[PDB]
């Protein structure tokens, strides 16, 4: 029976879809707009807008399993349609922020908990995949790295443990295709905790040139982030980074435990995405 991959044009969703197609599995790729390009080959395109959960009734026909992105505003509608269609297993792309002690006050933590909890209460089989910082967050430095050798960082000494999107897709695929993952919640990290400055330098090494952070003052960083995210989220980002300033973050072996392969390094990630950081 079919697997519905929501967000099949997304960074993670497209890799989940592609990997399932490589395995011979019938995949429906969920998109908000059927007219647009970017869907991997061999995927049946279906409208599946998680904010308009009446699209889901058609998208879930003949579907046994679902990969789900976190969209809190339509979760009760999703649960209802998944139950009605006979879905047996939902794998959710959540966040490690749900595991920290302030999760239910943190905007990011709350956003993901608002989808985890109704799934937990629904009776559907589930697996939660809970990454720490996405390696792809480094793509926000591309404009500065393309144009010069200095990047401006709010907290150059702040640690995260960035995880490669391919590893996330591999864990999702394991959860969709093998037994033993029911009610599992996998906290995913990369294999090394790294500061912002270290990440920037590793991008430099992949390019063959020395790229450095300079610190920007918090006034300036707050302003930049207030143009990209709501007020509450900027406060959490900066507070999160200040709390990890000079404090190495936890490295978990969860990727290796699930997939049998060590987590991909940020260096490898930078080599994989090197074209994003070269000038036009
Ligand atoms: N950034 C971090 O450090 C971090 C850490 C932990 C967890 N996370 C989680 O990872 C996510 C990022 O995943 P990603 O890298 O794959 O992002 P992405 O490349 O931006 O893809 C996001 C996908 O979500 C889909 N989507 C959004 N709203 C939808 C809706 N209403 N209905 C259907 N599909 C919808 C989009 O579909 P369309 O392309 O069709 O529009 C898009 O394909 C975050 O949202 C968060 O939940 C992030």
Residue 76's contacts (CB-CB under 8 Å, 6 or more residues apart) are: 118
Quick check: helix, strand or coil at residue 84?
Answer: helix
Q: Is 112 annotated as a binding residue?
A: yes
d(CA 6, CA 32): 9
Q: Please name every residue paired with 186 in a beta bridge, in sequence order, or none if there are none.
A: 129
The angle formed by the CA atoms of residues 138, 107 and 90, to the nearest 5 degrees, is: 80
Whole-number Å distance, alpha carbon 54 to ligand 1 midpoint, is 20
The one-character DSSP state at 263 is P
Distance (angstroms) between ligand 1 centre and the Cα of 9 equals 10
Name the burial class of residue 50, with classes exposed (0-12), middle (13-18) and buried (19+) by CB atoms within 10 angstroms of its CB. buried
Beta strand 212-215 with 150-153 is: parallel
- Method used to determine the 3D structure: X-ray
Instruction: Report whether 74 contacts 58 (CB < 8 A).
Output: no
162 lines ligand 1 (CB under 6 A): no
Report H helices in 42-126. Answer: 55-59, 75-85, 107-122
Q: Helix or strand or coil: residue 196? A: helix
Number of domains in the chain: 1
Q: Whose CA is nearest to atom 1 of ligand 1?
A: 134
Domain that holds residue 278: 1-280
Who contacts 244 (Cβ-Cβ below 8 Å, separation ≥6)?
Answer: 155, 158, 159, 160
| 12 is annotated as contributing to ligand binding | yes
Instruction: Assess contact for 128 and 186: CB atoms under 8 A.
Output: yes
Q: Is 49 in the pocket of ligand 1 (CB under 6 A)?
A: yes
Q: How far apart are CA 33 and CA 47, in angstroms?
A: 6
Residue 241: which CATH number?
Answer: 3.40.50.720
């Amino acid at each position: 029976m079919k697997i519905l991959v929501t967000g099949a044009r997304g960074s993670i969703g497209s890799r989940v879809a592609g990997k399932l197609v490589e395995r011979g599995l019938p995949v429906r790729g969920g998109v908000r707009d059927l007219a647009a390009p970017g869907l991997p080959e061999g995927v049946e395109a279906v409208q599946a807008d998680l904010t308009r959960p009446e699209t889901l009734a058609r998208a879930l026909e003949g579907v046994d399993k679902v990969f789900l992105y976190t969209v809190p505003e339509g979760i009760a509608g999703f649960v209802d349609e998944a139950r009605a269609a006979g879905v047996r297993h939902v794998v959710l792309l959540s966040s490690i922020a749900v595991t920290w002690p302030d999760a239910d006050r943190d905007p990011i933590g709350r956003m993901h908990l608002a989808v985890e909890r109704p799934i937990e209460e629904s009776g559907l089989g589930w697996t939660f995949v809970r990454p720490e910082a996405l390696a792809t967050n480094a793509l926000g430095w591309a404009p500065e790295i393309r144009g010069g050798d200095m990047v401006r960082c709010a907290y150059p000494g702040a640690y995260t443990t960035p995880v490669h999107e391919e590893d996330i897709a591999d864990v999702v695929v394991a959860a969709l295709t093998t037994p033993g993952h029911r009610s599992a919640a996998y906290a995913l990290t990369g294999p090394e905790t790294l500061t912002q400055a270290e990440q920037v330098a590793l991008i430099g090494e992949a390019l063959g040139r020395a790229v450095r952070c300079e610190r920007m003052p918090e006034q300036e960083a707050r302003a930049v982030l207030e143009g990209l995210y709501p007020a509450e989220v900027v406060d959490a980002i900066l507070a999160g980074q200040a709390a990890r300033d000079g404090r190495p973050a936890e490295v978990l072996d969860t990727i290796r435990a699930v997939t049998g392969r060590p987590a991909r390094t940020f260096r490898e990630w930078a080599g994989d995405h090197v074209a994003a950081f070269r000038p036009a």
